[PDB]
Symmetry: none
Subunit: 176 residues, 2 copies
Amino acid sequence: TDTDDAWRARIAAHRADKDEFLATHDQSPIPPADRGAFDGLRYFDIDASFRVAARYQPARDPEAVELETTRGPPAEYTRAAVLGFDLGDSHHTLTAFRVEGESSLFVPFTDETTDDGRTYEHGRYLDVDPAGGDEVALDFNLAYNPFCAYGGSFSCALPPADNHVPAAITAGERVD
Amino acid sequence: TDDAWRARIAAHRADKDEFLATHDQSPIPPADRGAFDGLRYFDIDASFRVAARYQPARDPEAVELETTRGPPAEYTRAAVLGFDLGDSHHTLTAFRVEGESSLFVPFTDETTDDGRTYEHGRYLDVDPAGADGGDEVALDFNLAYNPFCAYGGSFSCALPPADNHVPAAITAGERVDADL
Ligand code: EMC
Ligand code: EMC
Ligand code: NA
Ligand code: NA
């Protein structure tokens, strides 16, 4: 059913609504001081080569694991699965984490844009709907920054070294 | 004289380059040790060796400083140092660190802002013993040095508190090359 227009519209609508929340809402992660001057998040333009199908390889025996955080004690996740996918000509894997009380898998990553400074230095996050082992949708046009990227003092989970993708993921949120 | 003082400072900078350049425990990442060409300093200027009024905390309090990585660092607020640079008066808060006899004085100045010295600020060690209020202690900004993370390693170093900004160009002690 889903048209390309529908998908692009959905992404557009999401980035606009998000901008609105960040710019005006009391619980916005943008520090109050900087809200007036806030001009919207920066994004790569939408790109379908970064909207890929991932093979879902669930953890045989889901394991309690922890990720470093930027300002705090390590955060506790369950290793939930391996996501396997292709970007252009190369195959990649990312570990997906189960978060208590959240239905989507948490997939923090870094890529070559992390390294060259086009995207956030500590990396980016992707949410992935597990429902219900087979193939899931990996849309890096939906990659977003951790809260701490906006100046406030938040302790956020850091991507494991194993979740670096050796490729330029020119999709999703950037920092300009 | 100024000569013994200059010599001692010059000796310290040399020995420190030596250590950074060749020692296994150097904060210079192993990858860059061979290319390493020494730290960078402003020339030794006696106008930045000032007498500071020691004003000890009446009731020293546990405080926290933000760090470059990981949780805040825990220190005790031990004293205010008040001093003049050069026609203007300033105060810096000095911190007592567990197990170290010298007070820790992390700071920033206009060289931080203009990019001539390290972006996160610089550190100064000050020997408190055995001064009362208000005895003088020597504040020698020629001895200002960089946090470990200035060299590229992924260290956790304490950030100077906001009120430890000195509104002046402290052209003494360790500097950085911005072009690198
Ligand atoms: C972006 C979660 Hg602190
Ligand atoms: C310079 C302390 Hg990591
Ligand atoms: Na976030
Ligand atoms: Na240091």
